[PDB]
Design a protein around this ligand. Structure first.
Ligand SMILES: [Fe+3]
Ligand SMILES: [Fe+3]
Ligand SMILES: [Fe+3]
Ligand SMILES: [Fe+3]
Ligand SMILES: [Fe+3]
Ligand SMILES: [Fe+3]
Ligand SMILES: [Fe+3]
Ligand SMILES: [Fe+3]
Ligand SMILES: [Fe+3]
Ligand SMILES: [Fe+3]
Ligand SMILES: [Fe+3]
Ligand SMILES: [Fe+3]
Ligand SMILES: [Fe+3]
Ligand SMILES: [Fe+3]
Ligand SMILES: [Fe+3]
Ligand SMILES: [Mg+2]
Ligand SMILES: [Mg+2]
Ligand SMILES: [Mg+2]
Ligand SMILES: [Mg+2]
Ligand SMILES: [Mg+2]
Ligand SMILES: [Mg+2]
Ligand SMILES: [Mg+2]
Ligand SMILES: [Mg+2]
Ligand SMILES: [Mg+2]
Ligand SMILES: [Mg+2]
Ligand SMILES: [Mg+2]
Ligand code: NA
Ligand code: NA
Ligand code: NA
Ligand code: NA
Lengths: 175, 175, 180, 175, 175, 180, 175, 175, 175, 175, 180
């Protein structure tokens, strides 16, 4: 093997010793696994959403899935740049994730979105914590990247909350 | 008259004898007619859709109509390329169509979409039969084209199906 | 007069020598455009409000529609303002002035449900629409065909938004009691 | 009313309790009101600027007005995402703003720009303070957004300072 | 000669009898001539502008000339569409123009702009009279076009006015 | 049945009335597409891995090629998934499900050298390629020409990537012992 | 030599045995030779077309040439992917082609176009046969590609048929 | 006056002495006058072309006009850069031109095109002489520019030659 | 035959007598032939390149071939514009070429590139001689064009040189 | 002089007193000098890289040089905005830089990249330190900008590390 | 010789076999292009300086013009450098080398007013312009028509910037004592 899962060597290019790096690496790898389960669940919901608002939600979820994937890509890359090994296989991702994932049945849109919302909220809190860890290790590139992904993820989370709110243009008359 | 409605001459350029071509042309012309009535009814629905979801439907139906118009264009041009006369006038198109077309009143969006879905379905089934007919005549360009049209029509028909499905973000509480 | 601090005084209209529009003529258009500006900026700020706050099953579609309507209102305000200034007047500028010179009704600061908010917007659109039609006659009748043309270009976009809101509020939906 | 001006409910999506949220909300809402008076005053100046440098300044002010508006939009959105109500009507914005606003007369360009400069400087200082408040509440998405808007606003502020500086290509000979 | 300078045949396609058309054509042709001399003098000023503001003026005047050329093109094409002969040669255009044109010397930028403003003004006033003439002839396409030209010409003329106004960022201190 | 929590149960296939595809027919395609989906998502995740980790004298070129191959795999997965759903089935969704339903071989979590990694990728591509060809016959033979066409459009892109890897692994290079 | 002309190794990556691969390669290489003479002769007519329609023809033949080049490239790449050696040198291409090629003299546009039409017809019938061959060999990617090439070629061939048809706007009167 | 027609001051910035500069300026200004009559006459034929090829010609002449305008602009700017005064008014341009210009009547497309071809030929021979002149004066930027103008003009002139060649798709039969 | 291979008529439009033109045409036609064989061999190499660097070479050689094709197009069109007959058929192009062309076998990448470099070099040297020939004939458009082609050919030839140079990131350790 | 090298006046626009500013100014100016030596050395390497991977590295280095230049531009601008004078001349930049720069000889690619890597690592560490200095002075715009440049610079640094790693597709068999 | 650490030594010129340019010929162009490179990079760095520092009533227009002139200088430097390298020489690289090999005058580190700064820039442009004209003759006379063409393409852009500065410095303005 060139590198072993779980090892972190730091980077001589980035002047980050393996001590410091391993702390960011652990945080990032946890985040990577959560965000890729997120990705996969947003894709599920995007594939299956049906009903009166489905096209708008299909588009929003497809976008949300794209932003998770990009976040995952930046996490994994940064793990690798810091001398670590990002979690790669799908069973590894889901094993290492802490967030809850739906079973294989398809649920109605309100249920599915409320499940997503819970994943986002967990990722959001973790990411906040990890940006502080990064800044306190003086890894400002990591901290900045994490915040750049945070703000995207909060925006999608906030979208889902709004989708779920108790207002609508529909009236009992229109029914 | 440079050509007469109903005649088919084949094409020298495309090495398609008139016997061979006539058989494709009848299938393509029947598809054209149904596709243009589909285009006219999607346009109607696009113009008139109202209510809580109307803007997203207005956009979808606008797009679906453009996709129908393009399929119609490709069908008509292939008719012409194969030495036939594509059906051209609106009254001809409706008369040669086999699909049902709404009267001039405006129905609520569900009914309107359900009417569109049935047109798609007829078109989808016929196109499938016509791609086989084209392949068996060795007309692999026609088949290919038919299949590229089909996959866009099936995508739109399936979107309509989802819009009609029995799910929603709406709750009695939001009402 | 040569000693005033201000380069121009609110409410004055000087016409333009570049545009060959005398102050008399210009003042009449300026009075119309300034009133429209004010209503249009209050329109903008309320559409923003509704863009920011909209929630529920259609929110995202509405967020985007209202953010685009807000941008169109802003652009209409910009054109009106610039035309005031070109005609030698002073476009109403500060938010307090814009709101005070507006004749349309503004929501208080609370957030209402989406139907109520849209209906309030619809009312504002209606008012502006009627006034602009009057104002385009006024301009054509003064021979100020640029102002007229411009007012009409803004009118068609406002009418389009107004119409979209009327449709959003119509009594149809894909939703069924079964899906509930 | 769905929500009342002045209430802050936090967000369950963003895992931000109403305590924490209300502190960011107050800061952001103050900033929103200042930045929208800024917007409106930059539009004034853009509409009215005249003279030898007017086209360049018209363009710069129009841009500056666009960047303020975008900043306002991000502030207000974030207020709403955190469960607050962004200040919306124009008389509310101006009432809640702390910055000074010109009366309705049009002043010469040097005076107008110097007025703008003073608004920017106040917003800049406030924003610095608020980014620290955000980071100290662990609201890193807010802090990052505020800094992203800060850097835009400093750049326009710095532009105005340069416009006002005592150099020119003009000579008494050219006069 | 396929057509003779001065003749007007109307158009069958546009259902415009030659009496009706001739009246539009004379107004449009007189506008064309003035617009092309405007185009030539904006080009001149664009080529020669010098001094502290010259680059921004060079760009503005380049654009103003393109806007004039396009108005000229639309005028000339409408002449032709209505069965007339648009004035074509440079010596014809200048001879048929009513506006004043500088001699071949180069004047300072103020004088040059003031000369352009007077040309615009003449063009603006005539166009206004011509749009009414078009409307009253029922030629609503011509009127419409005239009004779309006018609003671009008025925008440029007003820009010139502002460049000439008595304000500046310049102070005696900066000198 | 009316009281199930789930709107659809994994493994069920309902066909589509919009697409005029009965459940019998649809189930056969759904079984093929679902198996392809799973292998394609494992393909994607391993290409990502290799994109992330590739090092050495050609890394940057490989990083970009593998990130683009990964995107193509993702898009193929998206189309397959969506087609499953359109045909009234339930696309395999969770990463654990995708990996469990995949027949292709996955690397363990260690990182290997670039030749080994590419060779492993090549194997996965080969498997998917063979299966897709079978699946396109299956669809054409069921008369589901949309599915067939789609499978072929995805096939040509996969084959292209597969081929690029075969070339990357060929025994030529500009490098000489002299340059070493 | 790394590979020998005529040899066909199949591909491990595409799971295509040399026996199956040789059969596609032989078809694809004949197509390639014909398509590349086609390309060179459309270039020629693109270079040389003169007369009353030339500019339009020059554009269409340039485009048709570029379509032929792109079909060639695909063909050649597919030969190579399948473990074969695409015909490469110009003398090889012309020797392996079955179509007729004009001598080096330049003919009038009608004759030149008729010549191309014949080349297109030959390629088109060959390609239909080859897409059956590929499909029957289970090589769907090759069949698909050939069909995508085919439709673009038939389109160009049909455009030539139309250029050559006995209609025109020109009248004896205009002459 | 800031500058006087006919005077040539050279440029300090370009290190071009007035003697050297005058010699380029005189060539460049003659070219400018010819190029601008050229422009006005292509506009004319663009406006007026009718008949069976008109739309294609209208487009090509519009483009050729715009190429001429761009060559003019370059020429004029170079005169000015070199301390000269580019000819500006339409009457000046036509007076300083050496080419022939049609009277105000409209001729048939062949005659009109033949007329333009003559203007192009004159400009083209003059420009070749001028690019030698510039080069021999060590003015390489002027020579380079003139050549870049030259190739675009020769291209257009050649396109006219082709439009006028004795070939066509039309046959007696189609008539 | 509308024209005969080998003849050169000059051009009236471009004021180039046939004596003058013939001399350019022979040089340009010889260049065309070599450029098209270069294009065919770059295409070959692009199709067949394999190994560690192959994708970046595949792209480079694809581009180099497009640059050759465009130079070929410009050469052939200039031949035609000057009243000559550009060499057109593949067997003619190879027969009129002076450069060496590989046989149909596939060689390793070094050998293949070295073969391309030698072709470039021949083309580069000839083009240099031809630009002088063009200038001395006063054909400054031809010269200019030749020089714009040359600088793109020299760029590609130099890229090949660098690919062949004796450096690498590869170490015996990485092996 | 308008300003003297080494003076820092702060900004009244940005509300940054000269105390605070001078601390950011010193840090930024040091960074500016390092990053511009970086720029210049990446350009060297980009100009000279040769061998089997040269085109890919040429492109990567050209990009890396562009990102350094942009970083330098943002640093220098921010120095000026804070009332300082950015180091401008090339001998000033290199004098003030602390990083090591190669002599004028060209070294092999591994050596050159390893030299670059060392510069990046020094800049990276310095930038981390300076972002903290900025945040601690409450200069959040500076801190954010520095981090935005940090993340770009780490990414290029990490690229170089990967280029230098001990893997390759090359085999002794391919040699 | 086989044991030198350096792959190429500054000041050497090897010509190119790809470009069929012998070392004798190449050395003459390389000497010209290297001197131009140096002046052009000092030009770039001073334009940057003036871009960064410009203040006053026209600053924004000047900032943008000088940032664009700086980019054009950089691109010209890039082409010259690359041509040196293609001809088998070693382009001057480090900032200290560039400044030392430059013949043009550089400002000290203080910041001057905009007229002074532009005038200094103008001088540098003038020098480069004259030298490039010589160098384009030199190249054409060596038969290196690529280098000549390239030098001329760079010349026209430099002349254009130089000319813009001359205009910026001309004695006209819209400003009047009345507006003061
Ligand atoms: Fe990535
Ligand atoms: Fe950012
Ligand atoms: Fe069509
Ligand atoms: Fe396709
Ligand atoms: Fe505006
Ligand atoms: Fe918004
Ligand atoms: Fe036109
Ligand atoms: Fe309009
Ligand atoms: Fe999708
Ligand atoms: Fe290719
Ligand atoms: Fe110009
Ligand atoms: Fe061509
Ligand atoms: Fe060029
Ligand atoms: Fe900058
Ligand atoms: Fe470069
Ligand atoms: Mg690594
Ligand atoms: Mg036909
Ligand atoms: Mg004014
Ligand atoms: Mg909310
Ligand atoms: Mg007409
Ligand atoms: Mg479904
Ligand atoms: Mg191979
Ligand atoms: Mg010719
Ligand atoms: Mg400053
Ligand atoms: Mg070299
Ligand atoms: Mg001057
Ligand atoms: Na709804
Ligand atoms: Na000024
Ligand atoms: Na014709
Ligand atoms: Na390599």
């Amino acid at each position: 093997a060139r590198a072993t899962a779980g090892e972190v060597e730091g980077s001589d290019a980035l002047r980050m010793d393996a001590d410091r790096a391993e702390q960011c690496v652990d945080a990032l790898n946890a985040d990577l696994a959560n965000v890729y389960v997120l990705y996969h669940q947003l894709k599920k919901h995007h594939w299956n959403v049906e009903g009166a608002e489905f096209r708008d939600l299909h588009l929003f979820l497809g976008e949300a899935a794209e932003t998770a994937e990009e976040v995952a890509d930046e996490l994994a890359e940064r793990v690798q740049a810091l001398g670590g090994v990002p979690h790669a296989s799908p069973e590894t991702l889901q094993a290492e994730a802490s967030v809850d994932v739906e079973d294989e049945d398809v649920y109605d849109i309100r249920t599915s979105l409320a499940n997503d919302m819970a994943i986002y909220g967990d990722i959001i809190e973790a990411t906040r914590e990890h940006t502080e860890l990064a800044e306190n290790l003086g890894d400002h590139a990591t901290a900045h990247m994490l915040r750049e992904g945070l703000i995207e993820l909060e925006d999608d989370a906030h979208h889902i909350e709004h989708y779920l709110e108790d207002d609508t243009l529909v009236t009992q008359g229109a029914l």
